[PDB]
Design a protein around this ligand. Sequence first.
Ligand SMILES: [Mg+2]
Length: 150
Amino acid sequence: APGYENPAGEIRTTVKANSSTGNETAPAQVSENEAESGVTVTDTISYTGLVGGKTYKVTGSLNLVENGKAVKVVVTATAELKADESGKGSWELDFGTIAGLEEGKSYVVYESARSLERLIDTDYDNIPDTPQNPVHEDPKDPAQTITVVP
Ligand SMILES: [Mg+2]
């Protein structure tokens, strides 16, 4: 086949819980009363180095964090999303309305964006043979974290 330069992708994530958004410094926060009432959780996935116009199966997980480690999947969400023509842009993944988040606990979002098509050449025959799949799985990323406060 002709010249095939492998795409090299990166995804970053920002969680929103009700009206609170995580950032580089501090997690999103919801009160115990908000947690009892059901928390709307959405995650923004900022991507670069994807293949323009290609569809990615995005899977997200909301994870209980203890001692800086993800110890329990609370909920997952999934959608098939198209990369912008430039291969850079953002997606929104809607987790819906989450019950049972506990006061004093932190929860972290992970994202996996896996192309439907084979876009990575693993064997240098110039033929792509495996999906492109950047991930963001940082249990200590405050931008992906929700903390329940009194
Ligand atoms: Mg190949």
